[PDB]
Amino acid sequence: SALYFQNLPSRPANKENYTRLLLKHINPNNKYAINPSLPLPHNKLLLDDQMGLLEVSISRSSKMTNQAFLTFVTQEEADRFLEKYTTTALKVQGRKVRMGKARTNSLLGLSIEMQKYNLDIKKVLKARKLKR
Amino acid sequence: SKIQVAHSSRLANLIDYKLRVLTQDGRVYIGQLMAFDKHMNLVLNECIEERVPKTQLDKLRPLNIKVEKRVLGLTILRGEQILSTVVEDKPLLSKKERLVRDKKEKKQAQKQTKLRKEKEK
RNA sequence: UGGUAUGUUC
RNA sequence: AUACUUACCUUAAGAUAUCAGAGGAGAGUCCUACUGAUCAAACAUGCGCUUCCAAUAGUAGAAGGACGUUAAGCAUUUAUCAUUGAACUAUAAUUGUUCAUUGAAGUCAUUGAUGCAAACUCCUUGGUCACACACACAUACGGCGCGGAAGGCGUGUUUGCUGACGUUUCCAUUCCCUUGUUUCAAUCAUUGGUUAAUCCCUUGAUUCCUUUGGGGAUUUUUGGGUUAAACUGAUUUUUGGGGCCCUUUGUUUCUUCUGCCUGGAGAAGUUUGACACCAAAUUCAAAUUGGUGUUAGGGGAGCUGGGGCCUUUCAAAAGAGAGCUUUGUAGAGGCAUUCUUUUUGACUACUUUUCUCUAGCGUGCCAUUUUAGUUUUUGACGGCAGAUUCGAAUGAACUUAAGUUUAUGAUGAAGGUAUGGCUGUUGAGAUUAUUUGGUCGGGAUUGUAGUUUGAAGAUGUGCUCUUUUGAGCAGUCUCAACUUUGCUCGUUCCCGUUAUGGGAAAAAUUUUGGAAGGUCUUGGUAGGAACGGGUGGAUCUUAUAAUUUUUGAUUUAU
């Protein structure tokens, strides 16, 4: 259950500050967005935000500096997201974002669906083939 | 406030910084220092003095706090009735620009001394 | 061994 | 501006980081371009470090405010006391109610003050940057672009607070282009490379002549030389086109002059100088005096400081040769010997009792051999199924073509290929039998026998100490250094010889420091070094722990 967010702001140098910024710009007056200096909980393979928004995922790779991904609880929260916005540009720092359903879901999505670990081993083997 | 005040700086190095100096009353003065002395008497450019009322103090005791701000401009505050000073905001121009400005001031002062030596002859 | 300021004449 | 009178005053000191050692000066003090360590400052420099740097694929938004509006928003709270008169509740300096004379100050503010809450508008700040509108991640995110702002850590150089004046019979001493940028196209000139003609030196090859050797031509094969017909990279003169900017608001803001939107320009100068402006009395203008501010930005050649990589050379440390049997020397360390008696403490064996894996064979336990079984491996390999594919090379089918499937399918590569599995081979991990072996008595109680220490005798070679069974040295044992003789293993080379020895390097190679060269990146480029101060500003100590900050009457409590 991963969503590809495109045309996002490029360079905040810290990752958790961009996480606070994104959880502030999804919904105002959030519990974790109104109070800074709060330790961000990590979810390994805990609900972090309302409207099913579980966590985000960014990277510093040079090919996708702008765009990033987000993951939810299930497909119903993503359908509620796209039924609540319904082709409407949600506002961030200066620009208009665009959301879509990614062609490959998150690894945390695999952790949710398979526990209702082989794909992590396949990704390690693909990384071993690419680094050779 | 993510300013990252210098870790080994003193009052000669904190000059022209937008200080937020606290007093014994709590009447916080915000402004740029431009001079000090042995008794820590601070001149303050574009200074504002902020307080909290007595009715707001009940809400402050364990949110929004409506502070009372008065504008003093360029004042000169004594070092007796002050408690602590911090650095709130960085100045406009940077360290390299202040270095170039100080080199221009040194060259202008040397030119003024050469003009005084020329007028003395 | 001196400094600051002021008033006249050239 | 000179000359003179008058009014006030004529100065708190000492010092410039700390610790240890050596030397000098007549316990104490001073100095060392004296040595090691810590700390501070400055300049460079690097740490896959820490935080931030605003859409333009729109008409937004982040931070701080409004001493801005709606807003006289909504909900609450106050707007003086005393004497007396006509009634009066009444412990007050008649407090309370209605009216008044008089007496002292008498915040304005009630459109006031506090709390609450939303919307709109406007100000200051930025990289409003270079590529792309992209399928990454449990070791949670390729932080491996050009920078800027703030900070941390680490390394190198200089100095021990810093700046002006004078002297040095001290060193020093550069320039060039540009004053909107970038891109594309056309033309001249220059430099570097490739192809052939007039060609030339050497050479692989071809052909002809001639005396073994050589000469003529081609391949200008190979490298170089002359010239420039053709091609390519870079710079420059001019023109034209496209994109952006002109807020540069005094239309580039270094200055002056001319001049500009059918354009973006031209000329001159630049730190003992020049430019612009303010203030004044001299009764227009003009001139004089005192001050203020500017003299800039980018790129390039030369020089220099520093950071990183590679190469050459020197010095040092391991490798180097080591391990062993024999001799001499001598260093260190430990104690010399044996029997008997007593059984002081210990150890072994045997006797009695109790308890324990089963009191004993076997069973069981321990090692592990993979000989075998069971089991496991993000184990590996190969293949099957989704299509096993790809180097779309070729053939065939569906098909205009593309694309799909299949073969030539091991000719080479991708573990299998799966985001479900499976097949077979191999090793390793655990268990049991076995190739096999060890083990089957231990703990508590009682007494005896044997060995050694506590003690007594006889002893054992001599010196020192000593009451002595006595302690140290010659004595003896063990180990390390030199030294020699042969064996074995061994880095490289040679030789007897490829068993193995002999000789040499006592090497190839790794690290550190120093000398030199090349490449990548950054800063600076006109002042610097020494000395002198009845020099100036900073830092420390004492006056100064007493009314002026800094050695306390600001947690509002009896």
- The CATH number for B42's domain is 2.30.30.100
Question: Which bases in strand D are touched by protein, i.e. have an atom under 7 Å from a CB?
Answer: 40-41, 43, 50-58, 60-62, 65-67, 114-117, 127-145, 148-153, 164-166, 271-273, 290, 292-295, 378, 414-416, 418-421, 538-539, 549-550, 554
Neighbour tally for B22: CB within 10 Å: 15
CA–CA separation, A65 vs A69, rounded Å? 12
Rounded to whole angstroms, the distance from the CA of residue B27 to the C1' of nucleotide D77 is 27
**Nearest residue to D548 via alpha carbon and C1':** B80
Q: Which domain holds residue B44?
A: 11-87
After which residues is chain B discontinuous, taking C to N > 2.5 Å?
A: 62
Contact predicate B76/B43, CB 8 Å: yes
Strand-pairing partners, residue B44, are B33, B75
Q: Round and report the angstrom distance from CA (B105) to C1' (D359).
A: 109
CA nearest neighbour of A105 among A114, A92, A93: A114
Separation of alpha carbons A31 and A33, rounded Å:
6
Considering all nucleic acid strands, name the nucleotide whose C1' atom is nearest to the C-alpha of residue A129: D414
Residue A35, classified by CB atoms within 10 Å of its CB into exposed (0-12), middle (13-18) or buried (19+), is exposed
Q: How was this structure determined?
A: cryo-EM
Q: Which residue has tokens 């902020």?
A: B50
Resolution in Å, one decimal, please: 4.1
What single-letter DSSP state applies at residue A105? -
Residue B48 near residue B30 (C-beta atoms within 8 A): yes
